[model samples]
Target: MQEILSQLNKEIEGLKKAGLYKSERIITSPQNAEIKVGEKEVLNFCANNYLGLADHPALIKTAQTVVEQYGFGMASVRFICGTQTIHKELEKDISEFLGTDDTILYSSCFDANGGLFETLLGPEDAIISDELNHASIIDGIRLCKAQRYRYKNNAMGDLEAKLKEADEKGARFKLIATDGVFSMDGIIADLKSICDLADKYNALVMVDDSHAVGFIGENGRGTPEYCGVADRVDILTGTLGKALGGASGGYTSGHKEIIEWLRNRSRPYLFSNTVAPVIVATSLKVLELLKTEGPQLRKQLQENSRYFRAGMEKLGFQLVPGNHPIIPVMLGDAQLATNMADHLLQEGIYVVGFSYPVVPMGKARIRVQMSAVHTQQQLDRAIEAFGQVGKKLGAI
Candidate 1:
């Protein structure tokens, strides 16, 4: 224990020296347009509350009502009588919403990822993935025995090459996986082309839509819908913890047989304690609210992203261009990104920076996510703060 602690301390010191150490901000208010973090009412530009439904009155009431009726914990995994009517109901709703034949709930998108690959594929199969796919997908792929092939990020020709490689290896049941949107840069996956590739190669497509669900596509279904291939993806994994209601839950929506296999065979689902009743209730209400209000909120988010990006570009601050709410202000050096975040917080705008190892070296930046709750005044204030600091730091 002492040796491990000593080594960890050394690593932490190295992180601090590298300007990659993370510090948490204390939030004293409900997630909203303005947040009280450590007694300062700062404009919130860091949360994944894309639809502004985290603290909605209807959602709160539904959660409270369900908790009153069902209590708190599930206290067991699914097969041990942890299944409830609400869980089944939520699964059905998600399936209907995503145009999938079935759905399975998990403790998190992490668990869903941890379980999916190993349970469904084997050494005889092939897993072709995007080179820059999310960490969860990579970990899941690592746990599987399938032959792995990686394509360059968003490169169609590269994906084709990977497919050809798997074919040449005589790998069966090829599966291609990728994130619905690459969150760091907010670039959505080309699901249309991917679906076409799957059809051409007789492969299955799975997308981790954790960043895209409840925020992308015309109806907020996800990337497949956004790219005009609603039924194209064979498996879709997403989170209820972000845009859904800021609560905890995750799901995999897909074909009936696939989900049944996951439920019966996946280690995470079979062994882990099932999600609590309150989370299921909150997620259910969230699904209903999304059914009714998703379009409007998604539109507002799109508009807010457009407004923020245009303002930042006009201010001459370097940033990645995208319609998704996540806008990254690229400030080449790590220290500069940290300094920018500190100065912004002091100016009452809350944001966080991403640097080395989490992202590529020298691509450090403050990641700002626009929300439907942000007003024009709040957006302008954030823009003004950036502009002022950017000019002073010569980061413009």
Candidate 2:
């Protein structure tokens, strides 16, 4: 243990010397369009608050009411004593919203994926995954005993090639997995083609819609709906922390058999405590509010995305082309990425620099996430700040 501790310390020193260390900036204010890092208020554009409800009074009030109504449960796992009426209702509510047969909740999206692959597929099965899927998805695949094959990001041809290879190997079952939106590039997976390929190859499809839930689709059912494959996707995984405006909770919405199987056999679901009652109740409220308030929130988010993308493009900035609210302004060098982020924060615009190894080394960027709560003026100011920063760094 002492020998390993010195080695670990050495690795940390190397990371710090290489400027690869991450330091969290403290937020003193509630998550919203504007936030406080310390003495100054900055326009926040790095959070996944797609619906701008992180600080919504309605949700806060709902959470307060639910806490009063249902006491928090932490002493037991779901099957032991954690399962409550609100837990089941929240699951059903998520299933209905996502148009799935059933839903199973988890402590977070990571746990949802952590317990997914291993529970479903064994050594005889094959898992063909996208190269740019989330860390959770990657780790889940690693944990599973399935024969794994990776295809290039959104490359239909590559996916077909992999599927053919898996088929040739006589794998019992095949599952194709991808992220609905590649968070770093803001690219929506080609679900239409992917669904078609699935039909051709007889492989099931899984989408981690952590970045798409509560936006993207016309009804905010995520990429499956946005890409017109709502009924085709086999497994839909997402987090409530983002647009759902919850502190932590995620769900895997899918067929009744799949969800029930997870409830019974999935380690994360079987071992982890159920989502907090306050979050479950408030999440139910979020889904309910979406019935009436969703369209407008989605519209503002789309508009903000378009306005920011257009502004960046017009300024000769290299941006990952997409309509998703996750607009990544590419800054090739790692130093430039971090420097620009610092400058943006100094300009009262809060955005984060994503460099290696969050993204590819040469693909460093400042990931700008838009929210419905941001006004047009806020968008304009953010755009101007980027322009000024780009000029200072000679990026444009």
Candidate 3:
């Protein structure tokens, strides 16, 4: 065992030598524009808080007040004992918000995907997936007995080809699953195309909207709304994390029968502790606020994303071209990406570097994320920092 552990340690050391080891900073303050990292406060450019509600006073107070009312943990699974009023409330709100007939809760979107595929799919079914879908989706697919086809990322032609193959095979229920937004590349999924293809193929669409929910679309209904296919997606698995206050919890929303099936047969939902009262209440509050206060934040985020992307381009820094808040500044070598991030930190900005195997080899980058909390001044400062670091590290 010691020898095996030692070998694993050496392998990790090799990764560090290759500049591929990830390191996280110590965030001492609350999630906000200015957060304490170690001994200093820096401009945060890495959180998934796209709407800046992670620490918003209203969201925070709701969490506290709900804790006072509902107490703490659920201490049991939903079917057994954990169903609270807040749980039902959030499920209802999420279902209505997404135009689904019903919704079922989970501990995390990760678990939601984990429990979804195998529970509802089998050998007679087929799963056509985008190559760049989230890890959770990949894992879920692996556990299922369904025939699988991985289409080229965002390549509608390839997706159509796969669907044709599934159709030729006479799959009983061909389900096409994709991420609503590709988180790493900041690319919005072309859901309109996917929906069209699914319609032609007579397949269902399942979107994991974890990254796009609460940020994309007019009322933050996610990729369906963003692509003008609000009624097209057949299933949606997403989280209250990310843009929705960065708290934890996952949910699946779809037709009432399928949701009921998930509640009864989904292993994670059936075996795991139910969505706790605190997170459920917080999620309810978030949905209410999303219905009311989301438009302004969504608009602000779009403006900020455009400004930052344009600013970086003007500086001649190579980056993933997109208008999303998650921006990847390209630095093909891992060491260079890590070095650029270090230099930016000194300039009071926080960002992270991704390298193989989180990303492909030769695609290492410093991913810069924007939040609605960031002021124009903050965005400008981060852009300036990146400009300097880009030149110094020859990242352009």
Candidate 4:
């Protein structure tokens, strides 16, 4: 025990020295455009609350009412008297919204990825993935027995090369996995090109749309719809923890056979406790809200993203160009990124910096995510603060 403690202490000190240590900030208010963090109210630009539905009154009302009707939690796993009617209804609701044949819920998208590959693929199969996919997908692939091939991030030609490699190896089945949106860069995958490659290779495509599901497409159906390959992709997974009420839950929406197989064999679903009744019921209300209020919120988010991106560019800051709500302001130095975050906080804005290991070395950045609920005035204030801080730090 002493040896282990000494080693952990040494590693932590090393991390601090390297400027790679991470610490959490305590929030005293609900997630929204303005939040109280340790007694200071700062305009938040770091949450994944894209649609601004995290603290909606309707979702809160529905959650409270359902808790009264269905109680707080199911004490056992889904297969052991935990499944409820609301859970089935939420699954159906998600399927209808996403245009999939069926859906299955999970505790989180991370677990959904963790349990997916091992259940469906084996040594005779192959999985081709993007080099920069989310960590959850990488971990899931590592646990599976399938042969693995990785292509350059969102490079269609590279993906085709991997597909040919898999075919030459004579794999029984091949699956191409990617994220609908790369969060760090806020870049949407070239799904149209990917679907075309899948058709040529006779392969299945799966997308983790956690970042794009809420507002990227016409009806917010995600990257598949946005890229004009809505019916071409085979499997879709996303999170309710982001735009859908910002509570905690995830689901895999896809063909009937795939969903049925997951229910029967996916270890996470079978072993983890069912999604809470409140979240399920609230999620249904969220879907309803999406049908009615989605367009307006999506429009606001788009406008905010455009406005912020232009503002940052006009201020002479280097930005990763994109139409998505997530915008990265490249700062180049690790300590500069950290110092800029502190400066922004002092100006009553909340944002975080990503440095080495999270992003490429010497390419540190501040990730700013726009929310639908942020008024234009709030955005202007944030931009003003950014300009002031950028000038002070000579980042502009």
Q: What are the models' TM-scores?
A: 0.97, 0.98, 0.96, 0.98
Q: What stretches of model 4 exceed 4 Å from their correct place?
A: none
- Each prediction's total of clashing residue pairs, residues at least 3 apart in sequence or on different chains, is 0, 0, 0, 0
Candidate 2 structure quality by residue, lDDT tens digits, 161-220: 999999898998999999999988888899999999989888999999999988879999
> How high a TM-score does candidate 3 get?
0.96
- Candidate 3: tens digits of C-alpha lDDT, residues 130-233: 99899999999999999999999999989999999998888999999999988789888999989988887889999999888888887877888988998898
- Clashes in predicted model 1: 0
Name the candidate that leads on TM-score.
Answer: 4
Candidates' RMSD to native: 1.3, 1.2, 1.5, 0.9
lDDT (Cα, tens digit) per residue for candidate 4, span 1-396: 799999999999998888777888999999889898889999999999999999888888888899999998899888878889989888998988888999999999998998899999999999999988999899989999999999998789899999999999999999999999998899999999999888888999999999988798999999999999978988898998898777899888899899999999998999899989988888899999998999999999989989988888888889987879999999999888889899889889999999878888899999999899988888889999889998988877
Query: Which of the two candidates, 1 or 3, achieves a greater lDDT against the reference?
Result: 1
Give candidate 2 regions above 4 Å deviation.
none
Error of 4 at 312 (Å): 1.3
Report lDDT per candidate: 0.88, 0.90, 0.88, 0.91
Best by lDDT: 4
Compose the digit string of candidate 1's lDDT tens values, residues 1-396: 799999999999997887667667779989888889989899999898888888888988988889888888878898887899988888999898899998999999999998999999999999999988988899999999999999999999799999999999998789999999887888888899989999999999999998888878888887888889887889999988788888888888899899999999989899999888998978888888887888788888888888898899998888886768889988988878888888998998989887877689888889999898889899999999999888877788
Runs in model 3 lying further than 4 Å from the true structure: 1-3
What's the TM for model 1? 0.97
Candidate 3 local accuracy as lDDT?
A: 0.88
What's the candidate order when arranged by decreasing lDDT? Answer: 4, 2, 1, 3
